[PDB]
Write a protein that binds this ligand. Structure first.
Ligand SMILES: CC(C)[C@H](N)C(=O)N[C@H]1CN[C@H](C(=O)O)[C@@H]1CCC[B-](O)(O)O
Ligand SMILES: CC(C)[C@H](N)C(=O)N[C@H]1CN[C@H](C(=O)O)[C@@H]1CCC[B-](O)(O)O
Ligand SMILES: CC(C)[C@H](N)C(=O)N[C@H]1CN[C@H](C(=O)O)[C@@H]1CCC[B-](O)(O)O
Ligand SMILES: [Mn+2]
Ligand SMILES: [Mn+2]
Ligand SMILES: [Mn+2]
Ligand SMILES: [Mn+2]
Ligand SMILES: [Mn+2]
Ligand SMILES: [Mn+2]
Lengths: 317, 317, 317
């Protein structure tokens, strides 16, 4: 089935943030047996390999923005590979890597499927501009590089001249927000972006959260879905090996319920598993708890259900 | 008082699964002060003691099925004992022991109350037939031998000639499911059994789940309730000392909610507190934590309310 | 803004309970920088200092009730200070210290706003009378002294002659109950007090709980809200450094949600952050976790939101 036809793309990229380790994410995600687990799940899996991200020397900053040419080049590379995978009729599966790679993942996917809607699972909005940022870390800026309404609010940053915003403020729903900067909050409310912060999840329950997300995005017509999943969207008790953890997050059950309901539409076309840093777990156990949760989240996207699954045969015969 | 009249049966049996220790379940639950705690709770308790399950040497496998004569005879003796407690006008309380004992518990309970309904709290369906099973472990097969619709699918297993299925597929509700075999999922779906996996609990909340379960079983007519509670039904962060643990389980509150709501019906008639294994704790605290959650679930079954309880006396005078 | 205009009162008092260390609650909340964090949240903050409690010699018990003159004078002192804060148009924020201080907190607030409505977030009802108590601890008795309907059921207790019951049994809503003494449960039933125990929280979800809480208190017209927050209302996984912890409490998320909802009304006029004991944490991290949780609870009451916040300026210019 098309909802089970996958194309793996590794992205060993870390320069979108200061913490070293997130680049090892795809290697650690593969050592868990991801291809194998999906193969047994009736999935047509193809490994497109790990992208060759060349070391760019003398990458001087753009104002407060760090490693611009490196982040722009990586996403540009990913945009071509994601675009190739989509023309091959496969669901793109990006294994990050920092959340800056989403500029490339969504842009590549939008070239083949421009009518796509985004579900951004994160504790963060990642909507800072090279002008609103306080840190200068580009992994907290990808949404601003992708929005059409934010054209002219983004300057000529070195390495991102290839960029052309491919989504409108209406084509994106946030889930799990609990750490939004003032600049980001001003962008969120003025653009009238649809979001479900932790407050909304507590009020409604993940069931109604999903009901409204899928209705708002897929109501009028059936359209491709791109799920960009920051592991920090879930509570640190489930994913501690991550760069920017925030308490009071989405539970393991909620994360599985989000990814189950998205499979159940059969409209998933793109997937991002981002911010898994194996060098940041306090114990080796906290590391495997993050990797196992990330694996479990991905499997649910492609059909693995808690009620169970079976093949189309008579088990009683 | 009918809902607070109890007959305790210790069922120290382990041969339905491969790990030693579960037979100590009746010991550790008693040492916790369960009996005394039930009497403090205005309960009329009788302890029928522990069943002696005389050694069955010469108990070779039936295909891949391990210890069939031992599992068969322990359930048969438990069936006689449960029926006896039921004649004496008491709610039967089986302290296990592995979940294969449920064949005895439900058969014995049904011998006296053939109109009973089953609420099965577990991560697993335990509905593999001796032919769909890959493990050969009988603790994952109790429901198959009890379901009337599966007659002609259960072969002639030594030790089980006494079994006559007593529950129709329409008379059972599963709660807590998250690890179901392909063969089991096919059975579940083809026979149209009412279930609420972890997906449904996430979707509706435990509030609607219990309202639906009690309306589903008692809507047509008020009948006796048999609750078979597997401790692995609750999350291993609450019940870690258990042989088959699965992450993303029922919370402490959710578990007390299910039992508090079953209590209020006033119709509880049979109770099974299965799979506590005090030798499967990684630390001594994990053991106490398991036994304590088990005892707290039990006390809610017989009247303990979180809002409080009071005697019909004037506390102000 | 009126809802971000605060009067800080420290109450370093522990004689309402037997466990030493709760008097250091004002010290640790201040050290965690609560006042500095409030001013960064656009709050008008005046510091009224930490109340000096004169050590009373020959404090003979009244029956089983320990230190009545000490508890009685400390509430008498706080009642004065709160009235003073209320008179100068500020929201009184009391940093405790044991929960007996709510006698003085609420009495003081009702002297200036006699139409106040009380939300009591706690694992306990604290409604024991000096005669229904078996512990003799006054931190488990403040609601009995404040309720009008119990006048005649409270005898002449030394240190409390200045007390005049100021609220009706219908002017209070409990959230989080799971540990209620029989006499307290009796009073709860006979006086028809509105409550959401953990049972109602599990049944309805914190959304419906907050809808019904504000609707019940504010339905007829806007009235001022007094929130009495005992850290033990939350689960000991989030607030361990406390005197009377109980399993199955409100989550970190549900706590934030209650407070975010109260702030949104713009009617918070009285607040008590109670029962933090920095000497009761097993590790130094248990102490910081409690304190950080208490800090976050106080921040939500004065505007801090999980969807984000911002100054009324243009961030894109
Ligand atoms: C908790 C604080 C100290 C921390 N700086 C933190 O989380 N902050 C977030 C929110 N805005 C920051 C930025 O713009 O640099 C951070 C972005 C995170 C990017 B993401 O892909 O991991 O979602
Ligand atoms: C997760 C996998 C590895 C594990 N073997 C596991 O839990 N599997 C379940 C599902 N079916 C298996 C069987 O037939 O043996 C197991 C039975 C569990 C029985 B019960 O009474 O404890 O519910
Ligand atoms: C769990 C049991 C053993 C324990 N004695 C416990 O918590 N019990 C509660 C209920 N009534 C007791 C009393 O009257 O002393 C306790 C009051 C707690 C006051 B509070 O401010 O912290 O809410
Ligand atoms: Mn992100
Ligand atoms: Mn994030
Ligand atoms: Mn079981
Ligand atoms: Mn089980
Ligand atoms: Mn309390
Ligand atoms: Mn209290």
């Amino acid at each position: 089935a098309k909802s089970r036809t996958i194309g793996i793309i590794g992205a060993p990229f870390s320069k979108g943030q200061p913490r070293g380790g997130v680049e090892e994410g795809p290697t650690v995600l593969r050592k868990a047996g991801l291809l194998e687990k999906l193969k047994e799940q009736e999935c047509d899996v193809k490994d497109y390999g790990d992208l060759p991200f060349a070391d760019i020397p003398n990458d001087s900053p753009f104002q407060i923005v760090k490693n611009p040419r490196s982040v722009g080049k990586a996403s540009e590379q990913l945009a071509g590979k994601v675009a190739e995978v989509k023309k091959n009729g496969r669901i793109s599966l990006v294994l990050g890597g920092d959340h800056s790679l989403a500029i490339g993942s969504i842009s590549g996917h939008a070239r083949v499927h421009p009518d796509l809607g985004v579900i951004w699972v994160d504790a963060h909005t990642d909507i800072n501009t090279p002008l609103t940022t306080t840190s200068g870390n580009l992994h907290g800026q990808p949404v601003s590089f992708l929005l059409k309404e934010l054209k002219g609010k983004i300057p000529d940053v070195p390495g991102f001249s290839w960029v052309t915003p491919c989504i409108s403020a209406k084509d994106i729903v946030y889930i799990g927000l609990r750490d939004v900067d003032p600049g980001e909050h001003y962008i969120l409310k003025t653009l009238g972006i649809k979001y479900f912060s932790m407050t909304e999840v507590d009020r409604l329950g993940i069931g109604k959260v999903m009901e409204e997300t899928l209705s708002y995005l897929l109501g009028r017509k059936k359209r491709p879905i791109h799920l960009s999943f920051d592991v920090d969207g879930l509570d640190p008790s489930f994913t501690p090996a991550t760069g920017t953890p925030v308490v009071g997050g989405l539970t393991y059950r909620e994360g599985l319920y989000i990814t189950e309901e998205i499979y159940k539409t059969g409209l998933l076309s793109g997937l991002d598993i981002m911010e898994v840093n194996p060098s940041l777990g306090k114990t080796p156990e906290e590391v495997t708890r993050t990797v196992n949760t990330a694996v479990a989240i991905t499997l649910a996207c492609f059909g693995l259900a808690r009620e169970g699954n079976h093949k189309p045969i008579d088990y009683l015969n």
